[PDB]
Design a binder for these strands. Structure first.
Lengths: 62, 88, 74, 73, 77, 67, 65
RNA sequence: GUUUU
């Protein structure tokens, strides 16, 4: 699980091959990334956003 | 179910995971679940995403293509008869 | 009805087309509820059996269910 | 008026099935199941936008999976 | 039943077609109903089209696990 | 908090959805469920101003919300 | 969650998965969210079908017309 | 009935 990752900064690599720096406040068993202060990896995109598990290829702890 | 077992049989090991995206990643298998989602301590480059600062990663299971494993880490008669037993 | 058809053509010769457009001609050995298909002595053609033969399989061929577009007789 | 009742009434008629891709089948509808898999009789199969890929003879189990549209007629 | 007929060839060399013009030949060590697979002594060959020409590439690995969602066909060489 | 519960307790607020088509949808949200199917109202879509609009969860890339 | 009954004999632009738009007259429907449309136009790009059935497992969006 | 076969 990502139950170790709560509130840490994270790097997400999407299946389309883009990277994002973010903070994961919450997540579900479909790896739907509930995150805030998202931005590329280089201009921010949002504070508080929802990413769908289907587009996550990979989550890394930073 | 079966491959959940087998993947658990491989913890504390260093494997090479290749994703569909063609990204490729070496590491120590720290955790396995049912969807086959993967966890790795000690991320390294062997095709590699541009990360230098990340230690431990969560690989979405649905996006793996290959897991590369040494012949040693595995009993082949075990897997074979297990498979022979699996129901479908 | 679909349920019984897949019992009705066992042993016959079928064309199975996959999502890719590849098609496989051969005798039906068996099939399951997940769309999986076992052919014996299957040949591989693209789009049509009138096209270039691309492969002959001497032994059994396992076609994965998710990938199956159709199972056609003739 | 329920979708399946429509598809039921088109049993024994000519039906046009349009895939979520660029492919179409026309033929007699014989039967369908709950997953809307489809039996077709003497289907002509087409690639669109045309081209006639094949004339089928006998019955065809057309995987309901990729089915997007059905059209009686 | 096609998965049983698959069971027939355990410890027997197999030829698998995958999405993306990828072919694997190797010895069938394991598999489940998702067509997930473990193979040994397996070479993968990939067909790639770049610069308007075809080429083929290769990749040997002793033990390899294979995600079943990409699997297309299984037979024997 | 799970993103989905955090969607059910979002009924009435205003949100933006990105479909995996390149298409963008601003709109306030009138209903949600377990597959993330959405019924929005007061809606505009890009690459058009609409009363209602239903969306299949599996066609969502992401969902930008408010500060 | 959507009550399609309020669309009886109405117009709706239905987006399908694979880039296929369809404008029809919502003649009927069910719970998997299958439609029955009338005077169906399939925007591929104009293409006219008649009274069609739309499999509601590839239905991507549903608005009005 | 819909993301990890």
């Amino acid at each position: 699980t990502l139950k170790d990752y709560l509130n840490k900064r994270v790097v997400i690599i999407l299946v389309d091959g883009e990277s994002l720096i973010a903070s994961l406040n919450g997540f579900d068993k479909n790896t739907n990334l509930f995150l805030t202060n998202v931005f590329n990896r280089k201009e921010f995109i949002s504070k508080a956003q929802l990413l769908r598990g289907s587009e996550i290829a990979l989550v890394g702890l930073i | 179910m079966l491959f959940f077992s087998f993947f658990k049989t491989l913890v504390d090991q260093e494997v090479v995971v290749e994703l569909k995206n063609d990204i490729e990643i070496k590491g120590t298998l720290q955790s396995v679940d049912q969807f086959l989602n993967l966890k790795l301590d000690n991320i390294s480059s062997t095709k590699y995403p541009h990360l230098g600062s990340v230690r431990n990663i969560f690989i979405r299971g649905s996006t793996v293509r290959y897991v590369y494993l040494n012949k040693n880490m595995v009993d082949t008669n075990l897997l074979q008869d297990a498979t022979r037993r699996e129901v479908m | 009805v679909t349920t019984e058809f897949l019992s009705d053509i066992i042993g016959k010769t079928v064309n199975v087309k996959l999502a890719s457009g590849l098609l496989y001609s051969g005798r039906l050995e068996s099939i399951d509820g997940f769309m999986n298909v076992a052919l014996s002595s299957a040949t591989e053609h693209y789009e049509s059996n009138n096209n270039k033969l691309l492969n002959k399989f001497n032994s059994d061929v396992f076609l994965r269910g998710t990938q199956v577009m159709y199972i056609s007789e003739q | 008026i329920l979708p399946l009742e429509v598809i039921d009434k088109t049993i024994n008629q000519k039906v046009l099935i349009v895939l979520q891709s660029n492919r179409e089948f026309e033929g007699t509808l014989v039967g369908f199941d709950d997953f809307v898999n489809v039996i077709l009789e003497d289907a002509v199969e087409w690639l669109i936008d045309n081209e006639k890929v094949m004339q089928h003879h006998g019955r065809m189990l057309l995987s309901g999976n990729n089915i997007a549209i059905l059209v009686p007629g | 039943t096609p998965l049983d007929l698959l069971k027939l060839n355990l410890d027997e060399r197999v030829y698998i077609k995958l999405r993306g013009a990828r072919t694997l030949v190797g010895t069938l060590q394991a598999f489940d109903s998702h067509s997930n697979i473990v193979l040994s002594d397996a070479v993968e060959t990939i067909y790639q089209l770049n610069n308007e020409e075809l080429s083929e590439s290769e990749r040997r690995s002793e033990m390899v696990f294979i995600r079943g969602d990409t699997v297309t066909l299984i037979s024997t060489p | 908090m799970l993103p989905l519960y955090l969607l059910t307790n979002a009924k009435g607020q205003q949100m933006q959805i990105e479909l995996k088509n390149g298409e963008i949808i601003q709109g306030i949200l009138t209903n949600v469920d377990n597959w993330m199917n959405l019924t929005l109202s007061n809606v505009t879509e890009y690459s058009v101003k609409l009363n209602e609009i239903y969306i299949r969860g599996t066609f969502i890339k992401f969902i930008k919300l408010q500060d | 969650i959507l009550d399609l009954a309020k669309y009886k004999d109405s117009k709706i632009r239905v987006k399908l998965m694979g880039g296929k738009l369809v404008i029809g007259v919502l003649k009927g429907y069910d719970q998997l969210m299958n439609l029955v449309l009338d005077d169906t136009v399939e925007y591929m790009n104009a293409r006219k079908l008649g009274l069609t059935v739309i499999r509601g497992t590839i239905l991507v969006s549903l608005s009005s017309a």
